[PDB]
Design a protein around this nucleic acid. Structure first.
Lengths: 50, 84
DNA sequence: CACTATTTTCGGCTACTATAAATAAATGTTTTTTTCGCAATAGT
DNA sequence: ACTATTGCGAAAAAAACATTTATTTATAGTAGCCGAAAATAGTG
C-alpha cells in the first residue's frame, strides 16, 4: 500500500487535482469580461495552463 | 512568417492609394476577421505613432496644372489643395 | 546547357524630429475648486 | 407612485501654463517606401 500510495496522500492528491481540473473551472465561471461603454468590445478566457 | 507577411501589409496600402487616384454587436464581431497573434508581427520601433506619412511622388501631369496656377496667382496654397 | 524571370542587393529618396528664439492668438489640457445636476435613496 | 432630501458627479472655470501656428541654418541619424540593378535559380 505505502509503496505505490504513500503517506503524504492528502496533500499531494488534493493540490494536484486543483492544478489540472479546478483551474479550468474558475475561468469558465468568470469568462467574458465586458464593459458598458464600447459595447462591441469583449475579452474571453479560453483555457489555462500552469 | 512575420517578415514575409510584413511585405503583404504594405501591399494592401499601395492599392488603396491608386484606387483613390481613380448581442447584436457581437454578430458583426463574429463577422470580423479572426486572426492569431504572433509576437513578431505587431513589433514597434522609433518609427511608430508619429506625425507624417509617405507623400505620393508627383507626376508631369500634375506639373502642368501646378505651373499654370503658380503662374496665374502669386503663391496660393488654398485653392490648389482642392485642385489635387 | 542556356534563357528567362525573380529575389535579392543597394543605394535613392523623401521625410523628419530636433535646436533656439523669437513673436503671438489660440490651444490645448491640467490641478484645484467650485458649481450644479441628477439620481439615490427612502419616506412620502 | 412620486416628491423631497442627499451625496456625489460631472463639468465649468480659473489660473496657470506648457502646447501649437509659420521661419532658417544644417548635420548626422532613422525610417519608411521605391525603385535600380544584378545575380541566381527555375526551367526550357
Amino acid at each position: 500500500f505505502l509503496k505505490v500510495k504513500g503517506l503524504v496522500k492528502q496533500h499531494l492528491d488534493s493540490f494536484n487535482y486543483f492544478v489540472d481540473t479546478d483551474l479550468k473551472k474558475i475561468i469558465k465561471a468568470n469568462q467574458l469580461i465586458l464593459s458598458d461603454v464600447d459595447p462591441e468590445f469583449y475579452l474571453k478566457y479560453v483555457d489555462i495552463r500552469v | 512568417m512575420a517578415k514575409k507577411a510584413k511585405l503583404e501589409k504594405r501591399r494592401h496600402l499601395r492599392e488603396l492609394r491608386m484606387r483613390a487616384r481613380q448581442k447584436n454587436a457581437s454578430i458583426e464581431n463574429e463577422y470580423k476577421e479572426k486572426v492569431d497573434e504572433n509576437p513578431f508581427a505587431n513589433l514597434y520601433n522609433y518609427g511608430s505613432y508619429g506625425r507624417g506619412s509617405y507623400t505620393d511622388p508627383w507626376t508631369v501631369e500634375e506639373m502642368i496644372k501646378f505651373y499654370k496656377a503658380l503662374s496665374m496667382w502669386g503663391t496660393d496654397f488654398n485653392l490648389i489643395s482642392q485642385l489635387y
